[PDB]
Amino acid sequence: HHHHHHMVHITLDRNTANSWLIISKDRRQVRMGDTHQNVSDNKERFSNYPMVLGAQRFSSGKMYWEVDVTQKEAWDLGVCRDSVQRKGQFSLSPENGFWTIWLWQDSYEAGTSPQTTLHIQVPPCQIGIFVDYEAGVVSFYNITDHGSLIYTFSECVFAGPLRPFFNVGFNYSGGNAAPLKLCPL
């Protein structure tokens, strides 16, 4: 792909974070803490899952960013509507305002309803995310495998401003403590 030139500097929004997340001083890394992180509750925080949004809102144009997923067993990445549900249980689907992929139990899947099996020969250590607002496209790229395409959502009905979306995953196993990191431009 040749999307790198639409690179945007993403930072994480602390106020949207689940209360167990630890966001770095530079707002470019997030990981699961082993306890509540001593913050007040608010209506923006994702309650049920270890999720956080980027601060940036996009309503037009082309945007690209990259995320490091090294040594994680589980995570979700993509974009979502600014107005997505924060409290209670929900599925990651375009009907609910999410355009995402994930790793879970040694398989990669796109967040369609129902979910779609992905075919990845080289397990990615860094993921590229491309959004074309006007075209209604969200695409995912395997940076470890020379930028190979992972998945394209097309005919997207965004229906609002978009925000970068992150889920560091549960760490029941003790094998998923590593952070998500926004990679340098």
Ligand X SMILES: CN(C)C(=O)c1ccc2c(c1)CCCN2
Question: Which residues contact ligand X by CB under 6 A?
Answer: 18, 20, 48-50, 170-172
Closest contact distance (angstroms) between CB of 56 and ligand X is: 24
Q: Which is nearer to ligand X, 6 or 86 (CB)?
A: 86
Name, in order, each residue with C-beta under 8 angstroms of 31's C-beta and a sequence gap of 6 or more: 21, 22, 168, 177, 178, 179, 180
Q: Which is nearer to ligand X, 94 or 179 (CB)?
A: 179
Q: Which is nearer to ligand X, 138 or 180 (CB)?
A: 180
Q: Which is nearer to ligand X, 150 or 180 (CB)?
A: 180
Closest contact distance (angstroms) between CB of 80 and ligand X is: 17
Q: Backbone phi, then psi, for 95, in 5-degree steps?
A: -60, -35
Distance, in Å, from the CA atom of 169 to the CA atom of 75, rounded to the nearest integer, reads 5
Sheet containing strand 98-104, edge to edge, reads: 51-53, 162-167, 75-81, 98-104, 107-110, 116-117
Q: Backbone phi, then psi, for 155, in 5-degree steps?
A: 55, 35
Closest contact distance (angstroms) between CB of 84 and ligand X is: 16
Could you give the angle at the alpha carbon of 62 between the alpha carbons of 55 and 7, nearest 5°?
A: 65
Q: If residue 32 lies in a helix (H) or strand (E), which one and from where to where?
A: strand 29-32
Closest contact distance (angstroms) between CB of 168 and ligand X is: 9
The residue nearest ligand X at its CB is 170
Cα 88 from chain centroid (whole Å): 19
Q: Which is nearer to ligand X, 44 or 170 (CB)?
A: 170
CB 167 within 8 A of CB 51: yes
Closest contact distance (angstroms) between CB of 170 and ligand X is: 3
